[PDB]
Amino acid sequence: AIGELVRYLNTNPVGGLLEYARSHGFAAEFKLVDQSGPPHEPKFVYQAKVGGRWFPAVCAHSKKQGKQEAADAALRVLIGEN
Amino acid sequence: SAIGELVRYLNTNPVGGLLEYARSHGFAAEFKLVDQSGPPHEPKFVYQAKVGGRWFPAVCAHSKKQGKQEAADAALRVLIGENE
């Protein structure tokens, strides 16, 4: 359980968080909280929601990185709780 | 928690509501600045509430006062969703 959470924390945290959700029968989702900036310097704020619970919101410079940064924050919260 | 718990604070005093919730669990209610953007005369702020080891939905606002209010309201609505 904890081992499965640590496994993909670095290489693919979205994948690790999605598998945690799948193992418990609920969803992991990545809320796009905000988009700012001009095309040459876009900024996104993302936050994970897993099974009705919300996790630290994070910033990033792409949607793809934003989702991974949000998943990383969520996994670290979950690793600590377990 | 029972139907109606915390509903009193919605749209009247959401920050004070979250402060009361936090005290009932022995924690401070925290409002975290997540991001700031825009030019100095038209800022945008993203805030989210935190109570102990629990996090709540992040929200966007044009001022710190409005961001905290909205973050508190979003947090209360998550908590009210636990009522049954």
Side-chain angles (χ1 to χ4, degrees), chain A residues 1-6 8-39 42-82, chain B residues 1-19 21-31 33-35 37-41 43-81 83-84:
Chain A
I2 203 182
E4 289 320 310
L5 285 170
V6 172
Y8 302 109
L9 175 62
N10 296 319
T11 69
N12 183 18
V14 164
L17 192 66
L18 283 169
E19 172 51 27
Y20 171 84
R22 189 203 65 69
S23 88
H24 292 293
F26 49 52
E29 288 176 285
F30 302 95
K31 165 72 173 165
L32 169 65
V33 177
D34 185 43
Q35 213 180 142
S36 64
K43 193 172 44 168
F44 305 83
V45 176
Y46 270 90
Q47 188 183 14
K49 184 191 188 189
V50 187
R53 166 158 196 207
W54 291 92
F55 289 90
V58 296
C59 308
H61 287 299
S62 63
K63 285 195 172 193
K64 184 190 163 133
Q65 296 167 290
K67 284 173 209 208
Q68 294 278 12
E69 278 313 319
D72 170 309
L75 284 178
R76 294 180 191 269
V77 168
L78 290 171
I79 290 156
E81 304 178 335
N82 278 277
Chain B
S1 47
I3 298 299
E5 288 203 78
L6 296 184
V7 168
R8 63 185 294 190
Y9 297 113
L10 294 179
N11 201 43
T12 64
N13 179 15
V15 175
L18 195 62
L19 268 42
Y21 171 79
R23 179 182 297 273
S24 91
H25 296 265
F27 296 118
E30 309 176 56
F31 298 100
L33 179 73
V34 173
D35 189 47
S37 66
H41 68 293
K44 179 158 60 167
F45 301 93
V46 183
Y47 271 92
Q48 90 181 119
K50 164 182 177 295
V51 180
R54 305 299 282 220
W55 305 82
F56 295 100
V59 296
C60 311
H62 81 280
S63 70
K64 293 144 207 243
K65 176 199 199 283
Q66 189 66 22
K68 289 182 28 133
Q69 189 170 303
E70 287 302 328
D73 191 86
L76 286 171
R77 289 173 179 284
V78 169
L79 291 171
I80 287 159
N83 298 347
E84 65 176 9

